[PDB]
């Protein structure tokens, strides 16, 4: 998984060199950001049930037809799959916060996303609408550098879906 620490080590290994002050400075940056990142991660974890339920309902408000019969939103299995998917997104966002890189999100969600979504006919727009809902609620929960960290990982997902 890409993190600040793995990336500096990988670079050094490619050059075949011992880690220098250049790498260690980068490493220090990761460890300082960690306090804000942890704060974000704890808050997202604490509100995760509420965040997901609101997110799913927002998708249904934004696209009313999904809930209508013969549509992807209709039926318990379909609705359950929605809540599962948004929960995955939150989980991988909190993992990325704690890891100090986008690598968790990249390996679990971003790779293969487009192919999967095409085959199953899952619209990127539904997910993007849910993530944007989350971003609004998180903004109420967190402030300052915690908030900045949270917003960046949510934005990474939104851009990958886009």
């Amino acid at each position: 998984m890409k993190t600040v620490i793995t990336e500096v080590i990988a670079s050094a290994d490619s050059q075949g060199r011992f880690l220098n002050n250049t790498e260690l400075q980068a490493a220090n940056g990761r460890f300082q950001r960690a306090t804000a990142s942890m704060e974000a991660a704890r808050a997202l974890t604490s509100n995760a049930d509420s965040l997901v339920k609101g997110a799913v309902q927002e998708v249904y408000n934004k696209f009313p037809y999904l809930t209508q019969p013969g549509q992807m939103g209709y039926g318990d299995t379909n609705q359950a799959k929605c809540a599962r998917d948004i929960s995955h997104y939150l989980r991988f966002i909190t993992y990325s916060l704690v890891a100090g890189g986008t690598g968790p999100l990249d390996d679990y969600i971003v790779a293969g996303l487009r192919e999967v979504n095409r085959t199953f006919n899952l619209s990127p727009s539904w997910y993007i609408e849910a993530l944007k809902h989350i971003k609004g609620k998180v903004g109420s929960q967190l402030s300052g550098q915690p908030l900045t960290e949270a917003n960046a990982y949510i934005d990474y997902c939104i851009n990958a879906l886009s």
Binding site: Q15, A111, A160
Partner: protein
């Protein structure tokens, strides 16, 4: 008139070994004024050969590099060197593997053959330790073997499984250990991870 008792058909050996698609491997050349259809063929060939039939998701495709190839700003040879220096290559074949495994992977990917002796291992391990990864990868691409066979426009293809001029005898059995099949790959994403198919004991 009477047939031979044993009586295999020509191609029987290739059929039996599962090298039937690669023993005489097809050669793909990027031509001038190439169509879009033609360029896509070359790219597929490159990814299969250079990345060891591992899957590449759409997020991983280089895209900017392909822009150059389509333009003619770079040759197939330069494109191959960019892929081999890329993190797509490094992640699969280099970061998890040992040097011993990395070197033989490079021969298969770039030269199309097995390492012929422990001296090839000694040379490339020595280069890496003195000059790091990029110099190493350059060696294969900037080698008389590369340049004479593929040159600039030909995508690397599998040369082993046929007799090559400076080949050692150990060369064909070693290619058999490196080739898993059409459905084989050289994938980091396994239970055991990247291990050495061709031991020092072998060399």
């Amino acid at each position: 008139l009477r047939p031979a008792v044993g009586g295999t058909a020509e191609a029987a050996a290739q059929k039996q070994l599962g090298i039937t698609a690669v023993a005489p491997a097809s050669v793909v050349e990027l031509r001038p004024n190439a169509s879009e259809e033609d360029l896509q063929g070359v790219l597929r060939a490159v990814y299969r050969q250079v990345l060891g039939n591992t899957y590449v998701m759409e997020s991983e495709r280089p895209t900017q590099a392909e822009s150059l190839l389509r333009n003619g700003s770079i040759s197939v040879r330069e494109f191959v060197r960019r892929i081999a220096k890329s993190d797509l290559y490094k992640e699969r074949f280099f970061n998890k593997a040992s040097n011993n495994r990395f070197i033989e992977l490079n021969f298969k990917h770039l030269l199309g053959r097995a390492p012929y002796n422990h001296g090839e291992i000694q040379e490339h391990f020595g280069l890496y330790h003195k000059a790091g990864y990029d110099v190493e990868i350059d060696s294969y691409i900037d080698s008389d073997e590369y340049i004479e066979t593929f040159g600039e426009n030909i995508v690397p293809y599998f040369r082993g499984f046929k007799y090559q001029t400076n080949q050692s005898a150990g060369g064909f059995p070693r290619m058999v250990k490196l080739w898993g099949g059409d459905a084989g790959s050289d994938t980091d994403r396994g239970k055991n991870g990247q291990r050495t198919l061709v031991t020092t004991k072998d060399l």
